[PDB]
Amino acid sequence: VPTLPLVPXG
Amino acid sequence: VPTLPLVPXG
Amino acid sequence: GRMKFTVEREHLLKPLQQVSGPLTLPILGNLLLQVADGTLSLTGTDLEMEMVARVALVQPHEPGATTVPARKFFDICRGLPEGAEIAVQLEGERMLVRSGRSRFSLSTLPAADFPNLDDWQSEVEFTLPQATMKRLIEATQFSMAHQDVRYYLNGMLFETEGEELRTVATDGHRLAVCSMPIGQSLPSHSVIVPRKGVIELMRMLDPLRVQIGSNNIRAHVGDFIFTSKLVDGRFPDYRRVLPKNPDKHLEAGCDLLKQAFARAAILSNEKFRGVRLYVSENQLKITANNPEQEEAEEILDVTYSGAEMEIGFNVSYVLDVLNALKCENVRMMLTDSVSSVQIEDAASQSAAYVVMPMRL
Amino acid sequence: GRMKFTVEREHLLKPLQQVSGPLTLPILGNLLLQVADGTLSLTGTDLEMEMVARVALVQPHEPGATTVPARKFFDICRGLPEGAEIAVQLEGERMLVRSGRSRFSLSTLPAADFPNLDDWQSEVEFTLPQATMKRLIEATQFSMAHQDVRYYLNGMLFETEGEELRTVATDGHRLAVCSMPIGQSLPSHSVIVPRKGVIELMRMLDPLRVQIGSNNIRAHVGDFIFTSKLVDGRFPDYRRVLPKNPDKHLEAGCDLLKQAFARAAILSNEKFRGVRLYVSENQLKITANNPEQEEAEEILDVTYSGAEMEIGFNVSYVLDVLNALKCENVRMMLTDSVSSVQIEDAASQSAAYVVMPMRL
Ligand SMILES: [Ca+2]
Ligand SMILES: [Ca+2]
Ligand SMILES: [Ca+2]
Ligand SMILES: [Ca+2]
Ligand SMILES: [Ca+2]
Ligand SMILES: [Ca+2]
Ligand SMILES: [Ca+2]
Ligand SMILES: [Ca+2]
Ligand SMILES: [Ca+2]
Ligand SMILES: [Ca+2]
Ligand SMILES: [Ca+2]
Ligand SMILES: [Ca+2]
Ligand SMILES: [Ca+2]
Ligand SMILES: [Ca+2]
Ligand SMILES: [Mg+2]
Ligand SMILES: [Mg+2]
Ligand SMILES: [Mg+2]
Ligand SMILES: [Mg+2]
Ligand SMILES: [Mg+2]
Ligand SMILES: [Mg+2]
Ligand SMILES: [Mg+2]
Ligand SMILES: [Mg+2]
Ligand code: NA
Ligand code: NA
Ligand code: NA
Ligand code: NA
Ligand code: NA
Ligand code: NA
Ligand code: NA
Ligand code: NA
Ligand code: NA
Ligand code: NA
């Protein structure tokens, strides 16, 4: 379950 | 809080 | 060859929605599907009650039976487009449902494991309009107990007497009874229908033939048959609960009385919900207060010529009655401040309500 | 003399219903009532947001202020009969409400203890149609996080840029952004409005003037003013989340696509909700299976001429997007099986949705 490339946190 | 005269149980 | 049928979505939807109601163990979450002699039968059960629907098959079909997960099958059919044709066949341990370019493969359990009622035995039978059964139930359902250790109070008494059918419900604090003529001479019988059976019966009432068995009740409505187990126990005799000589009669408009109790209730104790009634010549005063020492007072013109009296009630129980009455004017019949009150429609004695007061 | 006013129920009802929303501590369950210069003001707060309503007083009145329990006062007014006149005065530590022969005595707390926002400072101001604010919020509200430790994601970004107002919401798995022209040249500003502030703003949108302050946002709608604290934190930049060159474009009818995902979802894993998409020349196949090894398959005609691809999604996140689009045709813009997809109305770029796939 990958995340969106939120910086930080993904 | 009295009950109705149910027999038994009131 | 195994079970196979093709049916229009709109011939399946409402039967499926209805049988999917009374559904725990894995096979009890499935519907039994049976194809025989031009008819698809669908059955749902929770082991104590059962709902069966029959659907005429107008397209070619092959006889057989299986059980399939009920909510999934219903949701699939409901989710297909309006006008869809639904083809069903069995493939190993699965049921294959096809419509358009949609395919669904559902897990099955064998029809032979599905429960069935084996000792049915009918004892009284009659027919009545669905609207009459609905009035009887709606008149009393709210007074059934909820999870009382006295199991028989959690249901509803159905009683035949003379030419009338009667329902009774009570929880020990309040009682409701309603009687309606059904135009047939009936044997005297009394049975207790469990709460969930009453609810299911109501779902069907959208004429009705009723059979009361030794240990079960059965209702026939269109192409549906509903069966419920009955509850054991001695239900109380409403005739012994009604006040014997409630001499002091108050009559008031139902809307104004209900609206006044509803406003007073706002400032009643949130736990005990007590309000105080003061009855005097052609007047009723309702007062409520709470632990914050807030106070509500309502004064109403009524018809009353008895002695002055003060009496306390749980306002929720009073409002429950006024909301169940569908009448212009209400009659309250009083005895004293520590005895129950009888409430009825001023223009009809079909239903009566008995509410015990609270001590002041 | 102390505060006193008399008002028609129907002039009080809707203002009372609205301020009774944003309401814990005892005085925070009260409304502040203030009479001054022919106007009754009613204020509710939870210490972080505030709703104020003004009501013109056309009958004689006396200036003053008190605080009174909000839900009780509203329920009393709502429960009085249509057309009722409501008289209010202060009596010691209580508020006396009279209408007809109904009387209510409510507990008060002093107006001087009621909270107030003391350091308000406005930085940008503009007006826009209520329907535009509602579109902006409805386009993105469902993608806000819920109780995320990253507090700034639990709200909604409001951003002014050029002549446009923009909302952004994300929870880390999906993102929604919507931009609308407002016909005024705006400074560039970005603020985060907390979830409960977004909800309250929506309750008011039944034109709108907005002021964005240093630490608060304020909305003026008719005779209401709503104020909310803003959230601290660095909200993510949606421009960095959008896929950079999503070359593979699929177009499909929104209704058919939504209905197919909804049916497939029935047989998806109840916890992980994964469905598989297989894209090929002018075709989409959606498949779902669950731990019971049930299987759903949907095949749809679409417009697509890219390479064949298989990609997995949480079907709930996909359906959330399709339900928020109000369009005839949908465009899905794809890169590869491990990169996010962008979804938009085929005929409008006002809104865009980004959903991360699940690994197959
Ligand atoms: Ca058809
Ligand atoms: Ca086979
Ligand atoms: Ca059974
Ligand atoms: Ca049977
Ligand atoms: Ca008895
Ligand atoms: Ca009437
Ligand atoms: Ca009458
Ligand atoms: Ca009036
Ligand atoms: Ca005084
Ligand atoms: Ca405040
Ligand atoms: Ca202020
Ligand atoms: Ca960023
Ligand atoms: Ca359309
Ligand atoms: Ca289009
Ligand atoms: Mg078979
Ligand atoms: Mg199969
Ligand atoms: Mg099964
Ligand atoms: Mg007595
Ligand atoms: Mg004052
Ligand atoms: Mg007073
Ligand atoms: Mg107070
Ligand atoms: Mg990538
Ligand atoms: Na077969
Ligand atoms: Na059966
Ligand atoms: Na078919
Ligand atoms: Na039938
Ligand atoms: Na009390
Ligand atoms: Na005064
Ligand atoms: Na204020
Ligand atoms: Na008045
Ligand atoms: Na305003
Ligand atoms: Na799966």
Residue numbers in the entry:
A (entry chain B), B (entry chain B): 2 to 11
C (entry chain A), D (entry chain A): -1 to 21, 26 to 208, 213 to 366
Question: How is this structure described in the published paper?
Answer:
Griselimycins (GMs) are such promising anti-TB antibiotics that bind and inhibit the mycobacterial DNA polymerase III sliding clamp (DnaN). Although the co-crystal of msDnaN and MP A could not be obtained after intensive attempts, DnaN of E. coli (ecDnaN) was overproduced in E. coli and co-crystallized with MP A, GM and cyclohexyl-GM (CGM). Despite sharing only 29 % sequence identity with msDnaN, the binding pocket of ecDNA shows a sufficient degree of conservation. The binding pocket can be divided into a larger (subsite 1) and a smaller cavity (subsite 2) and as has been shown previously for GM and mycobacterial DnaN, all compounds occupy both subsites of the binding pocket.
